[PDB]
Amino acid sequence: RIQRNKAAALLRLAAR
Amino acid sequence: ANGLTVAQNQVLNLIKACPRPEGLNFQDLKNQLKHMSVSSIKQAVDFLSNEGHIYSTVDDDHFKSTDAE
Incomplete structure (x- = not known):
């Protein structure tokens, strides 16, 4: 469940 | 620029601050x-998560801001 959560968030934020 | 609603902004602000x-x-x-x-x-959490503003850490329901005001 929890893994690279921060990186996922950064990716989501960046990919806009 | 603020493609967020004042309540979600507030929630995010609380989470980050x-x-x-x-x-x-x-x-x-x-x-x-x-x-x-x-x-x-829960809706706000989902949204802010999808926006990559908040993320869950030690537990699913335990949020921090990645680097979003």
Whole structure:
């Protein structure tokens, strides 16, 4: 469940 | 630019600003923002997560801001 959560968030934020 | 709603901005601001090592757990969050119903917070959580603003850390319901005001 929890893994690279921060990186996922950064990716989501960046990919806009 | 603020493609966010004032309530979600506020929730995010609380999550990011609140000086707790343990981020701002959903229960702390709701205890602070008593007016902001659990469902509405779940929706906000989902949105802010999708926006890559908040993320869950030690537990699913234990959020921190990645680097979003």
